Amino acid sequence: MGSMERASLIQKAKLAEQAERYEDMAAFMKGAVEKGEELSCEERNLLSVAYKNVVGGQRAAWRVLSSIEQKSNEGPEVREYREKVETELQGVCDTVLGLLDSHLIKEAGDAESRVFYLKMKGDYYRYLAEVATGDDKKRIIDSARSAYQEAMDISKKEMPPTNPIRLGLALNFSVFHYEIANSPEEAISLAKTTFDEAMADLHTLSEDSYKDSTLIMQLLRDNLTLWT
């Protein structure tokens, strides 16, 4: 997208979202990141929405194919096609991780941007971990953990307990503990503490901030209900 203006890429990413063209949206936002300027809050959200939708469809397809493959192991085509989808998913995760490493994280100095990008880094390593098999699974899991932990440390020092990014980070790190790291008790403790500390800070919020924070709190509660 090197020949298109930054502002035109951002405008087209918003159009692509309205058209539910998430592959295009991700390509526009990759082009925008590669212009080299930092991203605003709204631009960070466009980048994240685009890739979450792309990789979310890949993950759903990989899970369907992995389930068919496991049943068949109870010709080579199911494994071949699961491998094709898996390689495509890994390529998208590697692309997002490469944007974060070149150079979104290193230029992110405010807590809101740095936490946002480190949460994304944890998420995309988590998606790599979902499809990883063996000892490389261990290093990928540790990369997710390390990114989430750095984001947690910053968020607890610099943001209030109701901040939606802080809440979504804690939600996704709790999912990491439950689903990836085989640490359900850590998942439950993090979700409970996060929920309780947010509850106690709701009194400080406007009506609109209250709505934003309570929405994510309900997701934490939904997981606690499933896990307990």
């Binding site: 999912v175 994510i216 997701l219 896990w227």
Partner: peptide, 9 residues
Amino acid sequence: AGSIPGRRS
């Protein structure tokens, strides 16, 4: 277990 949906800006 649900993560942030995060599919809509």
